[PDB]
Structure formats: structure tokens, C-alpha cells
Design an enzyme around this catalytic site. Structure first.
Site, short mmCIF file in Angstrom:
data_model
loop_
_atom_site.label_atom_id
_atom_site.label_comp_id
_atom_site.label_asym_id
_atom_site.label_seq_id
_atom_site.Cartn_x
_atom_site.Cartn_y
_atom_site.Cartn_z
N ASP A 170 31.51 38.25 46.65
CA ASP A 170 31.86 39.47 46.82
C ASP A 170 32.97 39.88 45.64
O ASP A 170 33.33 38.89 44.84
CB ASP A 170 32.60 39.89 48.00
CG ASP A 170 33.75 39.25 48.32
OD1 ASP A 170 34.41 38.55 47.61
OD2 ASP A 170 33.77 39.17 49.63
N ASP A 216 36.83 40.97 45.16
CA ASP A 216 37.92 41.34 45.64
C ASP A 216 38.78 42.23 44.95
O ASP A 216 39.23 42.18 43.64
CB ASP A 216 38.88 40.27 45.98
CG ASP A 216 38.06 39.11 47.02
OD1 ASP A 216 38.07 39.33 48.04
OD2 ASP A 216 37.40 38.60 46.44
N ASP A 249 35.85 43.63 48.91
CA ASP A 249 36.66 43.20 49.57
C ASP A 249 38.29 43.76 49.44
O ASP A 249 38.75 43.04 48.42
CB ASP A 249 36.93 41.68 49.93
CG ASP A 249 37.88 41.11 50.84
OD1 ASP A 249 38.50 41.82 51.33
OD2 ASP A 249 37.85 39.85 50.99
N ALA A 286 51.94 42.52 50.68
CA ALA A 286 52.90 42.18 51.58
C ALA A 286 52.98 40.71 51.49
O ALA A 286 51.79 40.13 51.65
CB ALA A 286 52.67 42.96 52.78
MG LIG Z 1 36.63 38.44 49.70
MG LIG Z 2 35.98 37.20 47.38
#
Ligand SMILES: [Mg+2]
Ligand SMILES: [Mg+2]
Ligand SMILES: [Cl-]
Ligand SMILES: [Mg+2]
Length: 175
Positions: A42, A44, A84, A98
Site C-alpha cells: 500500500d 502510507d 494508509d 504523535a
Molecule cells: Mg501500511
Molecule cells: Mg504500507
């Protein structure tokens, strides 16, 4: 080149909106290296928390949708690809994830993907997230792709700095 083309589309739309976004995770490693090193499950992204609606608008404009709300971010899908997404929050002089080491979201574009300069999270932030992963799944049991991406990030930052960061993580979360 589906993910590269999608990353470029997302960042074009974010640039037009004056919305900074940082590539995170495995793509951030490849961006900082300037080389695609493996297939990524994916993409991010780290986004300004208080501008979440603008990122959601980019996703919708590209024909996708928010798919899953997480404790500290959300998953979106655009076509067959997953995003993500996690927030960073303004800390006087920069956005920060954070609990991450200071400098997690540098203002300069410090990576390149297919000729395009891109903002990406810092090596220290990238490596810090692997420390959370090690508390979750014992490193001896990690999928080899994660073991390899971790060691690549550590070669790039350097063993000295990684040892000190790991020690700081242990002290942070010691009970
Ligand atoms: Mg991810
Ligand atoms: Mg990823
Ligand atoms: Cl959020
Ligand atoms: Mg830095």
C-alpha cells in the site's frame, strides 16, 4: 506503475490545494533512496490532522473512498490500491506525528519518486514505527520484506543513530 502514477496524482492534487503530505513507510524508504526496492502492499501517507477533509476530498475526486477508520488514522482505497493515512499535528514550527521523534515531517522534499521530488517522513520516524511493530510481532517472526526494509533504513541512518533511537524508545515505553 500503478502506485507511482497514483502517488503522483495525489501529490499533484495536494500541491494545488497547498496541502503538504508526507510519504511514509516502505514508499518513504524508497523515496529517500531514490530507488524502487520492492513491491509495496500500500501507500502510507502522513497528513495535517486539522486538514483531513481536504485529503478526503482528494481521495473522492480520484474516485476512491474512505474504507476503514483506525485508532490513529484511516484506510482509503482508490481502484485496487490502498492508502494508509495517519495524521500529524502542528507543533509551533512543524507538523509532528504523535509520540514520534522531533523532525518527523520535514518541510523540504527529501525524496524522489520517478523524477518527482516528494516530502517524506524522516528516517528516525520511519525506524521508530518499526519499534512499535517489534513490540507487536517478535522480530524473529517478521515477514522477510519487513526485516529487509528495516535493515535498509538502518543502513541509511547508520547503526550509531539507530542504537540511540532504540534506547530512547525503550526508555519512553519502559514500565
Ligand atoms: Mg501500511
Ligand atoms: Mg504500507
Ligand atoms: Cl485522523
Ligand atoms: Mg531531518
Amino acid at each position: 506503475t500503478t502506485q507511482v502514477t497514483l502517488i503522483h496524482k495525489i501529490l499533484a492534487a495536494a500541491d494545488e490545494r497547498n496541502l503538504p503530505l508526507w510519504i511514509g513507510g516502505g514508499w518513504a524508504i524508497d523515496a529517500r533512496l531514490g530507488r524502487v526496492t520492492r513491491k509495496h502492499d500500500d501507500i502510507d501517507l502522513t497528513f495535517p490532522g486539522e486538514r483531513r477533509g481536504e485529503l478526503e476530498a482528494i481521495v473522492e475526486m480520484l474516485g476512491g473512498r474512505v474504507m476503514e477508520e483506525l485508532d490513529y488514522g484511516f484506510l482509503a482505497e482508490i481502484g485496487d490500491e490502498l492508502l494508509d493515512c495517519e495524521p500529524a499535528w502542528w507543533a509551533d514550527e512543524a507538523y509532528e506525528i504523535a509520540e514520534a521523534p522531533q523532525g518527523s515531517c520535514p518541510e523540504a522534499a527529501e525524496g524522489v519518486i520517478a523524477g518527482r521530488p516528494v516530502r517524506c517522513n524522516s528516517w528516525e520516524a520511519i525506524i521508530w514505527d518499526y519499534f512499535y511493530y517489534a513490540d507487536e510481532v517478535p522480530p524473529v517472526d517478521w515477514p522477510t520484506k519487513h526485516i529487509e526494509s528495516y535493515r535498509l533504513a538502518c543502513t541509511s541512518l547508520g547503526a550509531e543513530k539507530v542504537e540511540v533511537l532504540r534506547a530512547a524508545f525503550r526508555s519512553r515505553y519502559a514500565a
